[PDB]
Amino acid sequence: AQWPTSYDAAQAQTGWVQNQGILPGMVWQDRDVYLQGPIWAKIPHTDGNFHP
Amino acid sequence: DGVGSSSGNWHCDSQWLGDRVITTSTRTWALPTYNNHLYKQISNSTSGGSSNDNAYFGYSTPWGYFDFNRFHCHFSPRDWQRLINNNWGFRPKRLNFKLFNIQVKEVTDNNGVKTIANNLTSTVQVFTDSDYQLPYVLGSAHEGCLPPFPADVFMIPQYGYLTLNDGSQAVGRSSFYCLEYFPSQMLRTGNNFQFSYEFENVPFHSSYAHSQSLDRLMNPLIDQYLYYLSKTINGSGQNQQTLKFSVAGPSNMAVQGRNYIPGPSYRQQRVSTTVTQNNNSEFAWPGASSWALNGRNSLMNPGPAMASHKEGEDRFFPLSGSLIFGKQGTGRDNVDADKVMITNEEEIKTTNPVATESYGQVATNHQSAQWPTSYDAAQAQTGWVQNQGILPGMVWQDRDVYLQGPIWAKIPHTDGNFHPSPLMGGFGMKHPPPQILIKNTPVPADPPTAFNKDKLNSFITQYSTGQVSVEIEWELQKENSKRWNPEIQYTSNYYKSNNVEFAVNTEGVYSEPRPIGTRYLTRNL
Amino acid sequence: SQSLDRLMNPLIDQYLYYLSKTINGSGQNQQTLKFSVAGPSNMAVQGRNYIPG
Amino acid sequence: PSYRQQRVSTTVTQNNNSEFAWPGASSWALNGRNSLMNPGPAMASHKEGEDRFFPLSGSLIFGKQGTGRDNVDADKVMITNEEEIKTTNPVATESYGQVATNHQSAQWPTSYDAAQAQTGWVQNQGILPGMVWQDRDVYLQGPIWAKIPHTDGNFHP
Amino acid sequence: DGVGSSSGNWHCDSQWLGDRVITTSTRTWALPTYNNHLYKQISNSTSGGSSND
Amino acid sequence: DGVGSSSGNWHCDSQWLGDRVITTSTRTWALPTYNNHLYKQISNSTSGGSSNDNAYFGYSTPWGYFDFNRFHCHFSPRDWQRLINNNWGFRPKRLNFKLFNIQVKEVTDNNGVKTIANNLTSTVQVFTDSDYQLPYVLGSAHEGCLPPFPADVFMIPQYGYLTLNDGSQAVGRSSFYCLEYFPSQMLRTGNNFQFSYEFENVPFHSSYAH
Amino acid sequence: SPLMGGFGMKHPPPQILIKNTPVPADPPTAFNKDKLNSFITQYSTGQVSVEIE
């Protein structure tokens, strides 16, 4: 709000989130498979992965 | 049945054992006739022309349901104090549910005077959705729970559900459920109903606060064997670039290397309880920080567990990042701040980011010196991180539970989820306690003496009452801390007052004066 | 057959409050704090346990 | 995942002629206190073909034998580099990628409404499904173990 | 008979098996007094003069 | 339950043995609805401005209690004469309590005329504070005991208790008790209640003069 | 020994509490979260027997 001096005061501002990573409490569905689509894939042999 | 015999007993107490506590609650309920025994399609168009964000399509059913998904339904205030002052964690194990002492009454309203009489031959239908084949509405923090005070008589809420909508219209994928399509038994006089359920394995709720912060886990006496960049120029300037490194360092704890980082964040607008400090503009929706789904904006209600405010300022709260309860007798439309109770998660500030602050800063360019040409050279620039997703090495605490807060929620049946702890607090399960549906069996009035194929729409006015008992066994996690100084404990204030806290007033109205958390004891890390 | 933002009971209010007004309107020094119950008519601001992926 | 770090060159003449160790540090805050994002998420130290660049605080820096403790030169310290994990982890001093920030549209009724496609830089990216990464390497002079903080939740501790 | 006891249950569902399906339906009925407990002879003449058909 | 069957009997007499006497008393009681099923905070301020000596703070409950803590509740005047004219001392040993023949009535008061009818499906809740977890008010010489004459019908008194007070105000140490926080069972039609108790060892009362 | 006369005990005969179970009147057909304050006017009567040796 105002408080000592004037220029310091500023209204609430928001920004757009174009990319969002995983957060706790998130839920989602994986991509659908198709009759012409692939069946399986090999998970790369790495130290870590998420939802492979 | 009969004057000299009952169909059920008292059963209202709490038993404390070594590592277990068993709570039993008994209440008296009243069940009216809902929707005149009809299923009705409902939508936002039936309540005027609203915005796209509030459009819905669903059905209202003549059934009622039992709700005890709140902690005060099972713990007395003193029992809650015993739980939170002596245990590091707790979790439900199994529950027992009983329905008994059914009484069905019929009402006649002729020429003004109203008469109520017993209807001994009427029935009440009860079933449990143990296969989770119906929409689950117990995880939306709705009213109609068992009253916290055992002496109160409560009304059973009406069951309704929503499905897919396009504005106020439906689509072919929308589902219609008839609750009479579930097994129906024939009952005699004096019957009772009961069933048991076992809670699936859930983690203990963290009913403690951390005595250490994530950025202060090092030894304050010993240096690290790691170096950090401390100087880039000698100072003065023309061509003074250099690279100097230093050891950190109890005197430079900020730049020390660390193994773990604070959990995820999602920026919320900051609101002050001192109204003169807020901006002189209407910002509740404009600065709400919401999320969108299929073109519909939904408020980011509490959301990720984040610290409510920085240290030394409890007058600030996130716009929609905290649970807000209403005081006893508080209205429902545009009430003042003194009529509501705003919770704060200040305990988790040791591991979770502040809800009204940026997660941190990140580099947004490549600093470069002169090199061929001049305009190409640019100083280092950073940008604010307003939302940060999960990163490896992240740690966080979940939202606290409250005496007036919800207990459990149903995890949506989807392909994937991450850390399915309910955002309003509690235990998230794939198979939560099943919904218990109840309804009065319709009793038609006198039909005409000539056959008519239309369904009957003239019934005897009836309602039912009875007693309901729910018993839940909880597992306890004891504390074995080596802390020397005394801990912080929840306690009542000795100072005199007109009324006793968590009691009834002169008019006989029970009230809960403040919200009670669970994080009073402390532990390291 | 259900959306993540429409999992609540459309007939029963929540026991949680949300900030609904910050000024009385007109202006010079009109800051205030008003809270409300949501609310089948205000499903957007209801508290929820899970969020989209 | 990634978390942008400032890029510093071992060739001092290539760096900006200004004092930036704290100002461009890329830190995180807790209870009003700023703490350096010391090494942090495991990310590739530099792009291929340039080992003269290192992240500001994204690498373990050991001291040589007999090295002092206050304001020592670069030749007195040993800067590690995680160049091996560049096959799966993002470069520490680069953006994770680009994302769309608007709706491209053609003409349609009126003119000013029309807008070309625009993209923005992603400086920090959290965990997403289908992500894979390698953890930070261990060293002969490095630590062996650590205690996971006793909290309600953590990810990949 | 009695408030605490019923004489019948829900029994309304359908069970699907390999080569069999079992359907169960339960409804509530109302039965009035018909014809004032009398048997009555009826004919087309009692409803006017109709055709031979 | 039923016309042809009762749930309890006469049981009103006194048996004299060698060194023991057994007294049995049966009375008919009436229990109204107290406090409109509410718990109410009470204090001296609610009854005007009294002196500091009479200040109090407590609660009134919708419960009633049974009182037989008077000698005429068990001894007839002739039985009392037999006791005091022939014995140097006496003391209680054990007691048996029974509640039976419960009848719940509902009252309708429309346009003046009052009608009373049976409510066969209603229940009455009874419990004993065998752990002494509630304030004890039977040792204050209060009214509401069983009438000395067996033929009299009496009203069950309302239960209330007091706690710590500072004038008409309360303090943090004050306790609030809810009687519904005790075990509650589901009852059918025609039930009865009974329990036994053994008196702890007490000295004989000196029923003599020196 | 009680000053008004009699036998003083640490564990005297326990208090026996009794109450009529409330029976609410007809509730409204629309849900309301407030506790019910409309009950059927009732009272109870019976017999009590106490035997002391």
Residue numbers in the entry:
A (entry chain A): 587 to 588, 588A, 588B, 588C, 588D, 588E, 588F, 588G, ...
B (entry chain A): 219 to 588, 588A, 588B, 588C, 588D, 588E, 588F, 588G, ...
C (entry chain A): 429 to 481
D (entry chain A): 482 to 588, 588A, 588B, 588C, 588D, 588E, 588F, 588G, ...
E (entry chain A): 219 to 271
F (entry chain A): 219 to 428
G (entry chain A): 632 to 684
Copied sentences from the primary study:
Carbonic anhydrase IV (Car4) is a newly identified receptor that allows adeno-associated virus (AAV) 9P31 to cross the blood-brain barrier and achieve efficient infection in the central nervous system (CNS) in mouse models. Among the generated AAV9 variants with higher efficiency for infecting the CNS, the variant AAV9P31, which includes an additional sequence (WPTSYDA) inserted between Q588 and A589 of the wt AAV9 VP3 VR-VIII, exhibited efficient CNS tropism with 385-fold higher EGFP expression in the mouse CNS and 1000-fold higher EGFP expression in the mouse spinal cord compared to wt AAV9. Car4 is localized on the luminal surface of brain endothelial cells throughout the cortex and cerebellum, and its sequence and structure are conserved in Mus musculus and Homo sapiens. Here we report the cryo-EM structures of AAV9P31 and its complex with Mus musculus Car4 at atomic resolution by utilizing the block-based reconstruction (BBR) method.
AAV9P31 has an additional seven inserted residues (WPTSYDA) between AAV9 VP3 Q588 and D589, which are numbered 588a to 588g. The main chain of the inserted peptide W588a-A588g is well defined in the density map. The inserted peptide in the AAV9P31 VR-VIII loop is very important for receptor binding.
